[PDB]
């Protein structure tokens, strides 16, 4: 929904789960499950292999979702030296550097964390 998300083209999806090597026809429980695919690299995974809740799955499927390694901070659009400590929203899975949150964070939030776009 962000302007810079409506604007970056989407890479061709790979129709194989990077984690279990199944397709949309077979996840780890040998049942069909649609894949989610990274908009930048095209790699895909079952939501069940990504450990996404059903609610989070619905939301990321409607967004320009990025995999763990491709994730860029939604504020500064960078990864940078602090990329490994980038927070992932538990509602939309967007990434934010702690220093790029509104308000900026000095310490890691405890428990489930929802980003500045998602909180009412």
């Amino acid at each position: 929904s962000l302007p810079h998300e409506k604007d970056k083209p989407v890479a061709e999806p790979i129709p194989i789960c990077s984690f279990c090597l199944g397709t949309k026809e077979q996840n780890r429980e040998k049942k069909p499950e649609e894949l989610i695919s990274c908009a930048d690299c095209g790699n895909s995974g079952h939501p069940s292999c990504l450990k996404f809740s059903p609610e989070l799955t619905v939301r990321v499927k409607a967004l320009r979702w990025q995999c763990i390694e491709c994730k860029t901070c939604s504020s500064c659009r960078d990864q940078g030296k602090n990329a490994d400590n980038m927070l992932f929203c538990d509602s939309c899975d967007r990434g934010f550097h702690m220093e790029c949150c509104d308000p900026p964070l000095t310490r890691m939030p405890k428990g489930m964390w929802i980003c500045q776009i998602c909180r009412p």
Partner: peptide, 25 residues
């Protein structure tokens, strides 16, 4: 909270790339 680092660990490792290639072939 979830970070890139902790998500990498909690999710579990990806399958071997060579096996992902023999699948896609």
């Amino acid at each position: 909270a979830r970070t890139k680092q902790t998500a990498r660990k909690s999710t579990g490792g990806k399958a071997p790339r060579k096996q992902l290639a023999t699948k896609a072939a």
